[PDB]
Amino acid sequence: KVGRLIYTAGGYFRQSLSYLEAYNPSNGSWLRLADLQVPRSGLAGCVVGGLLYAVGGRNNSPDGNTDSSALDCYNPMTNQWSPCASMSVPRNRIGVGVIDGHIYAVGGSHGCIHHSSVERYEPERDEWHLVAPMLTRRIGVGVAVLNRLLYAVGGFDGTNRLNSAECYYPERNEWRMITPMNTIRSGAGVCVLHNCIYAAGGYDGQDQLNSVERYDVETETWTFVAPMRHHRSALGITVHQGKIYVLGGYDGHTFLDSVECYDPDSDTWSEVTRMTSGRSGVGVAVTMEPC
Ligand SMILES: Cc1cc(O)c2cc(F)ccc2n1
Secondary structure, three states: OOOEEEEEEOOEEOEEOOOEEEEEOOOOEEEEOOOOOOOOEOOEEEEEOOEEEEEOOEEEEOOEEEEOOOEEEEEOOOOEEEEOOOOOOOOEOOEEEEEOOEEEEEOOEEOOEEOOOEEEEEOOOOEEEEOOOOOOOOEOOEEEEEOOEEEEEOOEOOOOEOOOEEEEEHHHOEEEEEOOOOOOOEOOEEEEEOOEEEEEOOEOOOOEOOOEEEEEOOOOEEEEOOOOOOOOEOOEEEEEOOEEEEEOOEOOOOEOOEEEEEEOOOOEEEEEEEOOOOOEOOEEEEEEOOO
């Protein structure tokens, strides 16, 4: 269990960013690692087999906006990025989850197109294949996996921001609606901790949110927990050693550098570190320290 870092890839502040930086909760340190080959915001990160993957996003730059179909793999042992097979379609403001060593890419946008499509990556074969689409088009969608079921939470369908959520049952290749959240949220941070899917922050169509609610997959209810100290949309999120970490985002005024940590035992959030610069739209995952 020792030696794991929280990696943050990409993001946005004025333009899309190429940063890869890793935070060590055991000593408070940050390391700057190899830049992404292409700057991107609105991407997702995940880890399979100790490799970090950056999935989708968009390169917002002075000279244009390019939605990304890219899958890139970072090996901490070499501090190098390598291209992997690209997805079927560009997906900005994507959500990603891992089931049994396979990466699911969910939703996202391509220009004015809001995807319901979903595809699955097989690392051993370096291949993507489309699976059943969601019941709803969703960009800015939060995704997490619990008990080998994939959840897609909130987002924006092209007309409305969503409180709805749905679950993918892989053995049936089928999506079904679940209980909707109490709050409309696009660009929330979504993760799994114990037996619940958490949705933290986001944007409800009027304000960036500090509220946090969790879906108990047994009782099918959403319950609010303690709110974050900061309102934030387009935050990064991950779980590490039984606690939720939220990174950056936008509070309606500032691109935040603050990282908060949720302790479920005490139902409290505390500020644990700051990123080296404020940013939103990062991808986040946990794996072993590099080199
Ligand atoms: C106001 C605002 C907030 C974001 O979180 C953004 C993220 C992006 F990737 C690009 C633009 C953005 N603008």
